[PDB]
């Protein structure tokens, strides 16, 4: 705890100057309590007007115990300095996620770089200017910290990996991803060991996944007793969409059944060639696509569709129509599960799944008004990271195709 | 006086050196004013004569807007000094103040000159008083305190001020102090007698740190003319708004005009500016003359009516509820009030953004609550209770069927027409016993001429010719047609993704008059169901209007 790794911003790059979002009096108070002690433990110091930098701070909950979350998105883009993501983690039968970010505050931060970590606790109604601090130790949320601490982390895990050669351990930011093909009870026991072996080496720690189920939802066609012009048009319309992706789908026999100028409500019976063309199109949709490959140099994008009744569909891709993963999340109302609650839970699940599988975060196209998000996303946010996002206007002809 | 306060370190932007602007020569009169002002300023330590090895300079000037005053041009220096934490941009809103028993305004005299300048940064402030006709060398000086008009002065001064205050507000948690620029606003609920004592204490405490201040004889009195406001002891209001009367209006005149209207709407319920702003959609040179529209004339006339009355707002009481009401004020226009007691408003405001070509009323009301929520957080650090003219039925149905995620504060319905209603609802299932129109449309992307037609399951087929339209505009006309020529219940079927999305959105107001017409139709209809099929797939019903409109 005396060695200070030197940290430098990418060439010709100044530090963050991100505006601070106003907060409720309840949230400001929680931030002043949190920062008053963090000043006592000497992890942050007050800064003077000769520091122009600024990064936003938010108060979250992760039980009456407020926490503080920092948006280092901008400084992470700007530090970006650096020293084979485990392909087997996604395959493991179990995976548990551990918060090991308190560990960072052991470690001092390069003196010259502290100015860039500046943050403001804002006041109400611009009565006072903010309270301005900057960080003395490695802050949670900065990509720098897991990289600096990498050394100590390998050191502390060498005992445990040697014992357990088949267990996969991957780190992303403040989190350790621990996977066994073990039985569950065994798995949680091996997790407790590593927890204890971490604590007793002085690394405090306070969510278990199962990537052995995650599967790209295949396209699903309705089963109806009596079809109608509408239901055939829907069915031909969807199968038409699916045909930019899967090559084998045909509609000649199915649209043949609509030759005419028919009432929509009219009942059309599924003739054989039509039924046998739809049955074959059900077996083409069972197979997965041909040539879709993860490019590590390119961003991952995630789109989300509100489906009503607590359902949300999502696609992750890097090139339009070339989906890497797809899926659907279902909430349980829980006497609330508001739209924003569900979108926020959903976004975190997609990001974890994305971390597991490729070890980075997707860029989110979010179906919501920007100002609404910027107001309420912290009332349900638990993760210590924050993915990039933008706000879209979802087409209404893709809500139903992904349904 | 100057301050025993510690200095803030300053640096130039890396790889930059100090200004070396040459001094313009001046009039012997102006030289005399500076020489006296500079010896006085020297006698107080604000500046110091320097040797000949300071390469830097910045011009200086003397003038007296018809007492003399010295002004310096720090443009080149300000270009080179580092960036600082942005001094307070936004001021507080009078509606966010808690009523106080006694309140004193203290102006800091010579604020910036009372604070020392960082030592190693002094060399870059050098200036020069010219000798008469360059006969002998002029006199070099440099600053020892915050120069007026330098880039660091506001943030460094404010910083100093805050620390200077700290010890005093540690021994007086009962006294509330705002600092804004060179001013301090101090209030208390102590007895106006002792309150005058604590004001006397603080003045002395500031004098001990170098901050001269006013006396009980010279402290400003209410009402307070502060930042376009009037602050009365029990109430606040804007300063009087005066809107020009002109026969012609330029872009500049209209900008200044919506400004003043925007201003007044924070306390005058009902201001509207939408048609006036629509004029500034031209966004051209500020001198161009804009012929006012009839809608613009009526809006400004109605604004003058409201500004005829006087209004006031009230201060904030943390122990009373916070409540917001919203009213429709006309197509696209809304107005709101925020109050803790029924007739005494903290403030008012308006919302009218369309955010796209087409909208509906529920979407706009929700966007209004959004705007109120953000403003409530900024001003009072909390969100209010909403009283709204919309029933659960209406809103619940809307946000459930809405594809976008949306947050609905708990509200109580208040009945006060115009209530907010869903003027209509497309069908979720096709309609039995209703004629199934197959619409289409088209235009030549070169001649711009076009046709919209339909063919129905009952054998009917039409085609209407269209001039100077676009494949999109015809696609909407096809639907318009099928609504005109239909019974109270119509199944429409289209191949136009464009037109589908515009309709499923269920707008009740629009920019294009076509979409306004379609809405007029949709309302009259009883059941309308709309369906989509991939174009040029030979579906049937769709192949036939395509062939038709093509021939
Ligand atoms: C008696 C009137 C009243 O109740 N006011 C003005 C609001 C009280 O709120 C203050 C609390 C502490 C210190 C000053 C207060 O009052 C002001 C607040 C903000 C800006 C002010 C600006 C001026 C001027 N000029 C005067 C008073 C101000
Ligand atoms: Mg901040
Ligand atoms: Mg067509």
From Swiss-Prot, chain B:
Effect of residue 259 to A: Complete loss of polymerase activity. 25% loss of RNase H activity
Impact reported for residue 184 to V: 22% loss of DNA-directed DNA polymerase activity. No loss of RNA-directed DNA polymerase activity
Outcome of swapping residue 186 to I: 25% increase of DNA-directed DNA polymerase activity. No loss of RNA-directed DNA polymerase activity
Outcome (variant: residue 186 to A): 37% increase of DNA-directed DNA polymerase activity. No loss of RNA-directed DNA polymerase activity
Effect upon mutating residue 181 to L: 90% loss of polymerase activity. No loss of RNase H activity
Chain sites annotated for binding Mg(2+) 2: 440, 475, 495, 546
Annotated consequence of substituting residue 107 to S: 5- to 12-fold decrease in affinity for dTTP substrates. Strongly decreased RNA-directed DNA polymerase activity. Slightly decreased DNA-directed DNA polymerase activity. No effect on RNase H activity
UniProt effect for mutating residue 225 to A: No effect on RNA-dependent DNA polymerase activity. No effect on RNA 5'-end and 3'-end cleavages
Every Reverse transcriptase domain range: 44-231
Effect of residue 183 to N: Loss of pyrophosphorolysis (reverse of the polymerase reaction). No effect on RNase H activity
Effect of residue 186 to M: 27% increase of DNA-directed DNA polymerase activity. 10% loss of RNA-directed DNA polymerase activity
Effect of residue 181 to I: 54% loss of polymerase activity according to PubMed:9533880; increases polymerase activity according to PubMed:9657675. No loss of RNase H activity
Residue window of motif Tryptophan repeat motif: 395-411
Record's catalysed reaction(s): Endohydrolysis of RNA in RNA/DNA hybrids. Three different cleavage modes: 1. sequence-specific internal cleavage of RNA. Human immunodeficiency virus type 1 and Moloney murine leukemia virus enzymes prefer to cleave the RNA strand one nucleotide away from the RNA-DNA junction. 2. RNA 5'-end directed cleavage 13-19 nucleotides from the RNA end. 3. DNA 3'-end directed cleavage 15-20 nucleotides away from the primer terminus; DNA(n) + a 2'-deoxyribonucleoside 5'-triphosphate = DNA(n+1) + diphosphate
Effect of residue 398 to A: Almost complete loss of RT p66/p51 heterodimerization. Complete loss of polymerase activity
Consequence the record notes for mutating residue 232 to A: Complete loss of RNA-dependent DNA polymerase activity. Complete loss of RNA 5'-end and 3'-end cleavages
Result of altering residue 437 to I: Loss of cleavage between p51 RT and p15
Result after altering residue 536 to N: Severely reduced exonuclease activity of RNase H, but no effect on endonucleonuclease activity
Residues that coordinate or bind Mg(2+) 1: 107, 182-183
UniProt effect for mutating residue 399 to L: No effect on RT p66/p51 heterodimerization
Effect of residue 296 to L: 68% loss of polymerase activity. 10% loss of RNase H activity
Domain observations: RT is structured in five subdomains: finger, palm, thumb, connection and RNase H. Within the palm subdomain, the 'primer grip' region is thought to be involved in the positioning of the primer terminus for accommodating the incoming nucleotide. The RNase H domain stabilizes the association of RT with primer-template. The tryptophan repeat motif is involved in RT p66/p51 dimerization.
Record protein name field: Reverse transcriptase/ribonuclease H
